[PDB]
Structure formats: C-alpha cells, structure tokens
Ligand binder design. Structure first.
Ligand SMILES: [Ca+2]
Lengths: 123, 134, 123, 134, 134, 134
C-alpha cells in the first residue's frame, strides 16, 4: 500500500478525503483531513503503523487510529478511536480476514454501536 | 444495552452468534461462540467494558475486544481420546477515548470513520496482509 | 424490578425518559437521560442502590440519587438530590409504604417545597 | 416559609397533621405528630434545615428528614401501669445540594424528578420491598 | 441464562416463584421467595455461581444452593410488638466439577443422572427420612 | 431404603442400571455402572451417606454424589496389549443440611425445589453450558 490519499464515509455517508501527511520515524503513517478554513487544530487524522515481530516473536502488532477533533470557539477536544490488532505469524490470512470482518460487523450491529455512540453500559 | 446474544458476520458474510457468558466484577461483558468441537476450551470472544471518568475526568474509556483462537486437537500416540489445546490466537483490541463534553454526532462519525477505514482496501491490506505503508 | 427504562415527570409535567445505563460493581443502578445533542455532561442521572444487612444488622440502607446538571457555555454544575432510607428488617411493609408516602407528601407541601426551591430557612 | 402546621398524606392517602414543635439553635425546624397513645415519647417527625453557603460557597445544603418510629407498650408482669418504649424507627433523609448560581427552573424539575422517581413502581420496590436492581 | 424470576415446584407440586435479588461481587446470583409474613428476614433462597478455570485448569466449578429457612415470630413478655427470628435452616448444596474438555453431552446426562437419583424412592428416603442405606 | 439396584435415566432418557457395590466403613453406600468396556477401572458411581447428629446438634448431613468418569484406552507404541486409564471425571456433589426438628414436609418440598431447579432451563444452562447468570 503505497502512501496515497484515501476516502472514507462519515455518518452522513458523505465522502471525506484524507490526504497523506507524514511517515514517522518509527513507521507511523499519518493522514490528515483539514477543515474548510484549513485549521490544523480542526483536522481529522488517521494513523496506521505495523510492528513486525523480533527475537523469534510470534506476534504482529498492527495499529489504526482515527482521531476526530471538535473545535471550541481556540482550544479543541478530540474524540479518538484506537485499534490494535495482535496477529500471530502462523495464522493463515483467512483468520485475519474474518477477524476484521467480525470487528466491522460488531461496529455495525445496533446493540454494540449503542455502546459507543450513546455511551451506555451493557446491562 | 440489555445483554443479548448478538450476531456478527464472518469473512464469508455468514452469521456467527455470540451468546452472553458473563458480566465481570470490573464491568466487563463477555460474549462467546464455541469452536467446531463442542468443547469450550478455546472459543471466539467479544469483550465490552466502558470505564466512566472520575474526578470530573474528561474521558470515558470504552473498550471492545475481539479474540479469535485457533485450537488444535492433540491425541497422544495410540490413544483412544484426544484433548484440545489453544494453539494460537488472533486478537483485535479497540479503545475509544471519548470526552464527556462532546456531542453524540462526533462519536457517531468517529465510529463511522473507523468502520470505513476497516473497509478501505488500502487500510485492510495493512491488517490482513501485514504490508507497511511506503 | 428488572432493569428497564423509567419515565418521570419534570416541573412542566413533561415526560422524561431515563434509559438504564449501568449496573455498578457495588450494586448501584444508573439511569441516564441524555440531552437533545447527546452531551454526556448534560445528561440527567438517577442512581438506585440497596444495601442488605450483614452480621445480624437490623437495618437496610436503600439509596436514591437524582442529579440534574446545567451546562455553562463546556463545564457544568450539578444540582443533586440524595435520599437514604434506613429501614429495619422487622418493620412490616405497611410502615415503609406510608413512610414513602409521607416523604412524597412533604415534597408536595408548599411550605416544605419552598425550603428547597427558594432556598429559604424556616423562621 | 412561615412556620405552620402542615398536612401530609399517609399510605391510605388519609391526612396526617404535623404541628410545629421547635426551631433549633442550628436552624433546624421540627414538625411532630404524636403516636396513637397521647404520650409523646415516640412520635413521627419532619425536620427541615437549610445551610447557606460560606465564603461565596457554591452550595446551599437543604435537608429534609422524615422519621417514623414504631413504639411498643411494655407493661411489667402483674403491673397496673404501662410505660412506652421506642421499639424501632424507619427514616428517610434527603439532602439537596443546590448551587447558588442555578435558576429556580432547575431546582423545580429536580424536585419533580425526585417525586416522580418515588412514584415510579420500579424505584418504589427498591425502597418498600428492598429489591436490588439486576 | 438471563436473570429472570424462576418458578420451582414444592412437595405439593404447587408453584413457588423466586424473584431475582442480587448479583454478587463474586458472581453469585441470588433468587429469593419471601416467607409467609411480609417481613424479609428469613427467606427461601437459591444461589447460583459458576467459577471459570484458572491457568486452564481442567475444572469448572458450578454451584447451586437451595436454602429453606424455618422462621419463628417471637413476642417478648408484656410487650406490644413482636419480632421475627431465624429458627433453623434446611440446606441443599450442590457443586458440579466439570472438566473443560468434556462436551455438553456429558454434562447433560450427568444432570439427568442427578435429577433421576433425587427422584428415585430409595435415594430419596436417604434425604427425606434420614435413613442409612443397608 | 434397602440396598437395591436403582435405575436412573440419562440425557437420552435411556435407562442406566446402577448395581450396589459396597457399604463403606463410614456408612457410604456405593452404586456402580461399568463403562463400555468390561474393564472395571473407571465406572459411573453414585454415593449416598447420611450422617446422624452429634450431641443433638440440629443438623443431619445427608450427601449424594454422582461421578461420571470419561475413560481412555491407551495402547503404547509397538505393544501387543492395551491398558485403560481414567482420562477425566465430571462430578455432581450434593449435601443437604436438615435440622432435626423440621418435619418431613419441609424436606420433601426442599427436594422438589432442587429437582425443579435442575429441570428449569435457565438454571440448567448454568450447569450444562457453563454460562454465568446475567
Ligand atoms: Ca437483564
């Protein structure tokens, strides 16, 4: 996946174009979606970094961050989503594919989505 | 959300029913789906725990875990019965840090952005195929 | 009383629907009524927790909290009502029934209600 | 509110007249209703005390107490006269923490919410029947 | 098993409704049925608690308790009011030890064996009649 | 209860005959049903023991055990003969504590309550399915 701008749909299904911002010192890839006025403090961000195993480690650590700030009219507070997948090296790609599919379907399920959107506990 | 068995789609978009197992001492709620064998030793799990803020803490910390174990059936040499062992596990661990001062609109499109990022092929190759961005 | 959303009337007699939020580690039940914009800091809350007696204690401690925040336009200040009933185990339910009825009628009485609403001392 | 005897309804919605007894050194105002016997040793009481804030304290602390004693008539073996003893007491103790910066609308619907919570059957079973939420 | 009032049949086959009381800090779930008097001092109880295995120890420890208290209403000499007291209690305490690798079939017919043993007249007189086997 | 082979129904409602094995030195009575193989190494067992009260302590301690072993036939490498081995065991252990002053009615409806609890689907899934109550 060569670094390239990616389009994501918001709650209204409207397209939202994140352009690539930065490749980190550690390997983190930062995509930014600026606001209308081009205010950095208001820009959405998406981070993607994958950590390979070392010293005969079985695990892969792949991280995806989605940060949505809201500006307060000067200082802004940020809602964040932070996902870490832990993937063993022997697992065939079938497993990782349906694991992702499971996560996305859990986000789509109304009961689970209520947990995040309405900050309600399970009871 | 009243604890209820929830249905999630796998890679083949087939249904996969997770039944509620337990509500933890810490507030963690566990849904399980048993393996192929009727034995429960390794099982697909979904954990949900939301941590409310303290001392007017700005932050709710809401966590979602999806654990997919691969189990292996070990049967000793020339034995009648076999025992099941947890071979390895794939995991996905999500922590949303939400501020108590935000509007639900923001959380809704944060979740939507995360789901669309998972659906995007360029980002999906990151997880599935373990390719770095370059 | 299985955990379930409950409806309460505000000062204007308008219905106000508290949905169940959380069952605590200690047993506290939290119901939340979000605002129009779904701001947590603005949500009304109602807590209910009952503490059984132990080590041959005669008393039951049943607690009801009603927290009403008002948002200041970012940080919000909360008016609270905190009720603790102390109920012995030998008392027949008749007593607890008319004790509650007494409390509610005291809240309804204009003289006593002035005490809370207008923060006036008795004189 | 000028101290006046107030009438409250019991479980049977019958009237119960509390006459003012005393205004305390601390500002506590006491209304009493005597027991069945003409003897005052145990009696239904309603206490009201509001504590104004200090050093521009944000908070008024307004307290309402409703004490319901059950008395027992003990008469010694083979005795002419009986003495009354306080057997046990049920109590309800309410502290409203109100900020000095709020509007009366907020306090009005806080009180209304509390009264409607007391009227709700699910919440009323909590007090009357000592059932936990689950 | 979502928490629900469960109806159990007594010796006369009459129904006896146990309402859910509380979910413990340790995971214990309590169902209660109050005594003849409305006073909730001694009450018929059913406790259920399952203990997961630690460090993949084969055992699941699933426990079921049925406590039947016999209560006594004692009113002292020359006293107006009576108080209630727990006279004695009959108890049944069941612990199933279930290995984490047996499939559900084994646990099903274990439960069936236990229930049929309770139903058998010879085994029943052991409990009911306090007779030894001989 | 004279010692007699007792028939118990399994999950499929098929009969399972337990023949009396032994009366212990401590009063324990054992009924056994042999495994599929004729080899009496691991065997389904039902233990019954009632303990009288000491110094008129109110308690009678009446115990019922149902042990279901799962066996494995292991034949070593390059060996003519196979030997059998106890792989694991599911167990149900019941202790009734019965006060020496309650009449038989109380014990009868206690047993009925326990059997109906075992029959209830919600309580049953607790044991069979190793699900917590929630
Ligand atoms: Ca529930």
């Amino acid at each position: 996946p060569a670094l390239k701008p990616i389009t994501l749909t918001d709650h209204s299904s409207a397209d939202v174009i994140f352009t690539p911002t930065q490749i980190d010192k550690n390997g983190v890839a930062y995509f930014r979606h600026l606001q209308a006025n081009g205010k950095p403090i208001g820009a959405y961000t998406v981070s993607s970094h994958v950590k390979e195993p070392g010293t005969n480690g079985d695990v892969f650590r792949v991280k995806l961050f989605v940060n949505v700030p809201e500006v307060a009219t000067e200082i802004a507070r940020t809602n964040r989503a932070q996902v870490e997948f832990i993937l063993p090296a022997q697992s065939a790609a079938t497993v990782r594919e349906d694991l992702v599919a499971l996560l996305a379907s859990a986000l789509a399920d109304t009961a689970i989505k209520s947990t995040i959107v309405n900050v309600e506990h399970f009871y």
